[PDB]
């Protein structure tokens, strides 16, 4: 009398899966479909390091704030890291028109070189480019201004009609940022440009706008009684941009020749940047996985798994775990 | 039916418990185990691999005068979150049912293979076991494991033992 | 197999019909009915409770100069509508098919338990019925029904009345 039996494998595992008809089913083997681990670093997407700005935001870096000269400008980046406590940008108060649009275009650049579009010593012999400093933008305790801009003041007692043009012939889009100062009092306008009624004109093939400065008193922000609107315009290669003003033109000296990429974002996080490579990015730290779902953060940049509200997504692989 | 699993079985998912005059223990069926492992590995790889996500950035930035488009983007993200959460939990639950039912069916067709092979030469005593009427040594009992059992060699001995 | 259901059962989804000298009637199998009721209730509650929505406002307002953003919002709403309608319809039909197959599996499992318990002591006459070769009393009926049938006690009587 011999006995042959049929049975199945059991482990000491306590991995419980959830099924439709039954919850909390202990199985022999399970495979997690949910990723809940991150490295706690801000890595490089597609092998290109991000652009960390530190205490500066995008406006302070792209306008040349005096607190942002220590930052390095790389040839290319994949995304932009901004500290949540960063407050260094637009030291002189006013509105940055289409700020978020420019932040979207500057999210990923494959080739970013900075050049002097208009040299300070060889473009304006008729205008004063040295007294354009203010207490809104201090540098080592002294008065300074934006690095990428020049606040042109009258040369003695005369601010004549201004006319400058830049020819783009380097095969890349050139981004040009300028500003229009709005003095609080007409005495400030007489002290700065001496013409009580001025205008600013910036024109291109696609861009054409005539700016009139507005002379009225405002609430005092950073000890400034008047505002300053900052504008921007991409310039196609083989095209030119003209600057024309009786006054109130804060004219670029450095412009940026960029070739842009698509599909990037800006991360607001305190997570430090480390030398690492991931295909997925997250403000809490990068994700390196192949599972289709994750529950770390909704805002992800890269080829990232779909964010779910789940806490446990385990797929059963082996049999039921019934030891007896 | 079969009450519990075998913690002494490590060579495979599916197998046997031989016992005769000269031995007892366990001997896992390698073919059915390897087929089930390949099938459920393809199941997990098919769930994982069919998700192809393009290069994208979820977050968008809006100022104080784009509250409607900000709420539109938040509504888009929350609807995607609800769709993906419901589909993920329901896919996990239905696929876990189908995996466990696949395991129970593998148990039952292994039982059916040995039952259809043995015929009247053994006795069904419950919990997947067969008590042999004849003398079936380890060559015999190993030959039952794969599908090379000679019924008429032991049929007369089982007929004499049954009555 | 089993052609039709029985209206006379009230307390159970599954059960037995015994007919002997002392009478007849319908007795429900409480274990399988309670297991099926718990599993089906957990299945339904798994369908509802995975809908983890948040607070939201679906409707957006626009002026006449934001027709493109309005059409984007309508495209978002129609895509969410199509996804949820297709997923809900296919989910309901697939789970209805799985529920009917589960009930058929419970019927076949009860039949397999009874058929493996009785063995050769009864005839398989069809329509889910076993006629006993021996005089199976009422105590014999619920000895079958709680899983403690005495096969060799009635084996001699079943062999006598078989031929």
């Amino acid at each position, epitope marked *: *009398g011999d006995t042959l039996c049929i049975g199945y494998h059991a482990n000491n595992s306590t991995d419980t899966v959830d099924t439709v008809l039954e919850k909390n089913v202990t199985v022999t083997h399970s495979v997690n479909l949910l990723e809940d681990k991150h490295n706690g670093k801000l890595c490089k997407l597609r092998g290109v390091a991000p652009l960390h700005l530190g205490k500066c935001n995008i406006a302070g870096w792209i306008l040349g704030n005096p607190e942002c000269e220590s930052l390095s400008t790389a040839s290319s980046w994949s995304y932009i890291v901004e500290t949540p406590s960063s407050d260094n940008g637009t030291c002189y108060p006013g509105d940055f028109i289409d700020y978020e649009e420019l932040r979207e275009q500057l999210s990923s650049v494959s080739s970013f070189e900075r050049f002097e579009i208009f040299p300070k010593t060889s473009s304006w012999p008729n205008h004063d480019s040295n007294k354009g400093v203010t207490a809104a933008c201090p540098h080592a305790g002294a008065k300074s201004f934006y690095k990428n801009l020049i606040w042109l003041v009258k040369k003695g007692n005369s601010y004549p009609k201004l006319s400058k043009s830049y020819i783009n012939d380097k095969g890349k889009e050139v981004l040009v940022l300028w500003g229009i100062h709005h003095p609080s009092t007409s005495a400030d306008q007489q002290s700065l440009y001496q013409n009580a009624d001025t205008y600013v004109f910036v024109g291109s093939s696609r861009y054409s706008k005539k700016f009139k400065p507005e002379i009225a008193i405002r609430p005092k922000v950073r000890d400034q009684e008047g505002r300053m609107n900052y504008y921007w315009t991409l310039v196609e290669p083989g095209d030119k941009i003209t600057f024309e003003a009786t006054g109130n033109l804060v004219v670029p000296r450095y412009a940026f020749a960029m070739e842009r990429n698509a599909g990037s974002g800006i991360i607001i996080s305190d997570t430090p940047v480390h030398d690492c490579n991931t295909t997925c990015q997250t403000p809490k730290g990068a994700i390196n996985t192949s599972l289709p779902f994750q529950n770390i953060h909704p805002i992800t940049i890269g080829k990232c798994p779909k964010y779910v509200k789940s806490t446990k997504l385990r797929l059963a692989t082996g049999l039921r775990n019934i030891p007896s | 039916f*079969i009450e519990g699993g075998w*913690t002494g079985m490590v060579d495979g998912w599916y197998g046997y*418990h031989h016992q005769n*005059e000269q031995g*007892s223990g366990y001997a896992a069926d390698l073919k059915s185990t390897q087929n089930a492992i390949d099938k459920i590995t393809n199941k997990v790889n098919s769930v994982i691999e069919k998700m192809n996500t393009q290069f994208t950035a979820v977050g968008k930035e809006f100022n104080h005068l784009e509250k409607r488009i900000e709420n539109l983007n938040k509504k888009v993200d929350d609807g995607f979150l609800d769709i993906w959460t419901y589909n993920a939990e329901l896919l996990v639950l239905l696929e876990n049912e189908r995996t466990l039912d696949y395991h129970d069916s593998n148990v039952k067709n292994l039982y059916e293979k040995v039952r259809s092979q043995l015929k009247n030469n053994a006795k069904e005593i419950g919990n997947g076991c067969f008590e042999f009427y004849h003398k079936c040594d380890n060559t015999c009992m190993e030959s039952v494991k794969n599908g090379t059992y000679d019924y008429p060699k032991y049929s007369e001995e089982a007929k004499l033992n049954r009555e | 197999f089993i052609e039709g259901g029985w209206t006379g059962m009230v307390d159970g989804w599954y059960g037995y019909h015994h007919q002997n000298e002392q009478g007849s009637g319908y007795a429900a199998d409480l274990k399988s009915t309670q297991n099926a009721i718990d599993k089906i209730t957990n299945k339904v509650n798994s369908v509802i409770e995975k809908m983890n929505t948040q607070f939201t406002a679906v409707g957006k307002e626009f002026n006449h100069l934001e027709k493109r953003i309005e059409n984007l919002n309508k495209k978002v709403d129609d895509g969410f509508l199509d996804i949820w309608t297709y997923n809900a319809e296919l989910l309901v039909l697939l789970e209805n098919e799985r529920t009917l197959d589960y009930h058929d599996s419970n019927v076949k499992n009860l039949y397999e338990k009874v058929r493996s318990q009785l063995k050769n002591n009864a005839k398989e006459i069809g329509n889910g019925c076993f006629e006993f070769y021996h005089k199976c009393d009422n105590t014999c009926m619920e000895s079958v029904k709680n899983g403690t049938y005495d096969y*060799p*006690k009635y084996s001699e009587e079943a062999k006598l009345n078989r031929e």
Partner: antibody, heavy 122, light 108 residues
């Protein structure tokens, strides 16, 4: 509770035939497998034989193979053991014990009996 | 057969302390190992089965360990009724069931 009362022990010459019995009560005899365990004087416990719950397959130890025959009566709720041509090493105290599981999980001994002494002497 | 060698052959300990009892195996029995007790004149008693599960009516002071070759039985508190001769049980590869030679646990 479970009760296992043994009987049939005594003094027998070598080469004769002896039979023991083990009366069971308080539980269903026909669903639990049955055993016999002996302990020789000056030795340890030695397993003797096993019968199933329906009494179909039978195993004996290597020393007592061929000479021994286990049997049971499920109607009378009584286990048995038969010897032919006993040995001087066969003299021991014999315990009947209950297997708490089935031919899937044969093995250990949940309940025991008082036991009877077999004295094989001339 | 899977022979079962018990070491040491005699454990002499005072009541109230820890006791250990080993039973080596020639073949790995996975976890299917049990232990037994034997008073002089009384019936044997099943304390632990499958090397981790204690039986009903057994005090919690008895506990076993081991998986495969080496198996040990540990008594947390030696009371006055714990003295006797102890045996180890294999059930993995049995056409014969093989016991250990025994460990006589006494009063010193």
């Amino acid at each position: 509770q479970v009760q296992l009362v043994e009987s049939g022990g005594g003094v027998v010459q070598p080469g004769r035939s002896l039979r023991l019995s083990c009366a069971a009560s308080g539980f269903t005899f026909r669903i639990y497998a049955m055993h016999w365990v002996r302990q020789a004087p000056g030795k340890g416990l030695e397993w003797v034989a096993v019968i199933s719950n329906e009494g179909t397959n039978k195993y004996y130890a290597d020393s007592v193979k061929g000479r021994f025959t286990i049997s049971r009566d499920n109607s009378k709720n009584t286990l048995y053991l038969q010897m032919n041509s006993l040995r001087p090493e066969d003299a021991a105290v014999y315990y009947c014990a209950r297997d708490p599981s089935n031919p899937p999980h044969w093995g250990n001994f949940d309940s025991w009996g008082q036991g009877t002494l077999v004295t094989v002497s001339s | 057969e899977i022979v079962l060698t018990q070491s040491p052959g005699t454990l002499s300990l005072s009541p109230g302390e820890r006791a250990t009892l080993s039973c080596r195996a020639s073949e790995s029995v996975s976890t299917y190992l049990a232990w037994y007790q034997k008073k002089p004149g009384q019936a044997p008693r099943l304390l632990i089965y499958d090397a981790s599960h204690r039986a009903t009516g057994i005090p919690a002071r008895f506990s076993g360990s081991g998986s495969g070759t080496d198996f040990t039985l540990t008594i947390s508190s030696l009371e006055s009724e714990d003295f006797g001769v102890y045996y180890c049980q294999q059930r993995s590869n049995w056409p014969p069931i093989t016991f250990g030679q025994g460990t006589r646990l006494e009063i010193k």
